[PDB]
Design an enzyme around this catalytic site. Structure first.
Site, PDB file in Angstrom:
ATOM      1  N   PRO A   1      39.358  43.528  36.217  1.00 51.98           N
ATOM      2  CA  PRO A   1      40.360  42.791  35.902  1.00 51.98           C
ATOM      3  C   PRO A   1      41.194  43.617  34.921  1.00 51.98           C
ATOM      4  O   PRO A   1      41.054  44.292  33.814  1.00 51.98           O
ATOM      5  CB  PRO A   1      39.676  41.632  34.932  1.00 51.98           C
ATOM      6  CG  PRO A   1      38.287  41.982  35.210  1.00 51.98           C
ATOM      7  CD  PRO A   1      38.090  43.024  35.603  1.00 51.98           C
ATOM      8  N   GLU A   2      42.412  44.080  35.302  1.00 49.85           N
ATOM      9  CA  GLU A   2      43.516  44.817  34.467  1.00 49.85           C
ATOM     10  C   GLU A   2      44.399  43.539  34.034  1.00 49.85           C
ATOM     11  O   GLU A   2      44.238  42.237  34.116  1.00 49.85           O
ATOM     12  CB  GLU A   2      44.223  45.434  35.580  1.00 49.85           C
ATOM     13  CG  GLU A   2      43.041  46.759  35.883  1.00 49.85           C
ATOM     14  CD  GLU A   2      43.694  47.764  36.825  1.00 49.85           C
ATOM     15  OE1 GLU A   2      44.991  48.075  36.675  1.00 49.85           O
ATOM     16  OE2 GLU A   2      42.774  48.160  37.445  1.00 49.85           O
ATOM     17  N   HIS A  91      23.812  36.028  36.354  1.00 48.86           N
ATOM     18  CA  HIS A  91      24.293  36.935  35.485  1.00 48.86           C
ATOM     19  C   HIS A  91      25.468  36.102  34.551  1.00 48.86           C
ATOM     20  O   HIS A  91      26.420  36.629  33.778  1.00 48.86           O
ATOM     21  CB  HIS A  91      25.196  38.095  36.137  1.00 48.86           C
ATOM     22  CG  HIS A  91      24.144  39.245  36.815  1.00 48.86           C
ATOM     23  ND1 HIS A  91      23.124  39.949  36.133  1.00 48.86           N
ATOM     24  CD2 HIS A  91      24.249  39.539  38.191  1.00 48.86           C
ATOM     25  CE1 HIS A  91      22.647  40.362  36.960  1.00 48.86           C
ATOM     26  NE2 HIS A  91      23.026  40.441  37.981  1.00 48.86           N
TER      27      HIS A  91
END
Ligand SMILES: [Zn+2]
Length: 266
Positions: A1-2, A91
């Site tokens: 994720p940018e 997770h």
DNA sequence: CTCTTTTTTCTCG
DNA sequence: GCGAGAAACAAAGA
């Protein structure tokens, strides 16, 4: 994720969870709450989510009158909105449960962070991080950008990744922006001429704007279409769309780096 | 089996 | 102050 992916998650969350009262909060990995999980649970249980903002790659939940939960997804963090009876996945680490579903945070590498601070601490928090301007025409002033570049001998790709010249670029968009602006990632910034700096500045705004419009590159966010527009990142050995040369991959300051050797002259 | 690969912030010299 | 390298962590591929 940018930044485009973080903005996509922000918008989705804004649409879906604003107005929701947090009924409970649970953690199987409480150590990722850097300000203390039990403290966060005690402060935020019962409060209503009022808004979601973003600064660079950071998400900011606005909760209650005066709380801000700053969330960084780092390399693999993912949020999803799930039913209250949803099965646990391996997770998953934290969940905020609402009356009609729950917001779960998962992160395979456990790098992502949550920090609870008050409203009046948000601007100082980002000043302390030295985050540079958002990549918009209004906030990203080319004149200061040019002056910073002229005075440095850093290489352009690692300097852009620092988030101090302009916030939001990570490995994918830095490589895409440098290809679009025809600049080699190892170029020392003090060697860039004014016209290249102008193209670079505009290309940063344009490419991130485009990525946001297409819903980012690919849970929340998973609908993105920008991956279909990438010209270099992960394209090693394919042909450059402009000149037909093979895209090459090298290592630059420890990061995988994709570029066209014709269009991005060393 | 080993090694490499995939945002931020640290140590080291 | 700088850059090089690595850690935080997990998993997949060669
Ligand atoms: Zn080319």
């Amino acid at each position: 994720p940018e930044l485009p992916e973080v903005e996509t998650v922000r918008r989705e969350l804004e649409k879906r969870i604003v107005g929701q009262k947090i009924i409970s909060i649970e953690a199987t990995y409480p150590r990722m709450v850097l300000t203390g999980f039990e403290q966060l649970k005690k402060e935020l249980t019962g409060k209503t989510i009022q808004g979601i903002s973003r600064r660079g790659k950071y998400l900011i939940f606005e909760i209650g009158d005066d709380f801000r939960l700053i969330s960084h997804l780092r390399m693999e963090g993912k949020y999803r909105l799930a039913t209250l009876d949803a099965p646990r996945e391996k997770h998953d680490h934290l969940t905020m449960k609402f009356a009609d579903g729950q917001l779960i945070y998962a992160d395979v590498r456990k790098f992502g962070t949550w920090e609870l601070i008050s409203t009046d601490q948000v601007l100082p928090y980002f000043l302390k991080k030295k985050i540079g301007p958002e990549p918009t025409y209004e906030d990203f002033d080319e004149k200061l950008f040019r002056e910073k570049l002229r005075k440095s001998t850093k290489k352009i790709k690692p300097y852009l990744l620092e988030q101090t010249l302009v916030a939001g670029l990570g490995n994918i968009y830095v490589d895409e922006v440098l290809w679009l602006a025809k600049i080699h990632p190892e170029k020392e910034t003090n060697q860039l001429i004014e016209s290249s700096i102008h193209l670079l500045h505009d290309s940063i705004i344009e490419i991130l704007q485009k990525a946001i419009k297409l819903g980012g590159s690919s849970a929340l966010g998973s609908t993105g279409k920008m991956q279909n527009e990438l010209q270099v990142y992960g394209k090693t050995g394919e042909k450059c769309s402009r000149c037909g040369a093979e895209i090459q991959k090298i290592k630059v300051a420890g990061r995988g780096t994709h570029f066209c050797p014709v269009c991005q002259q060393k």
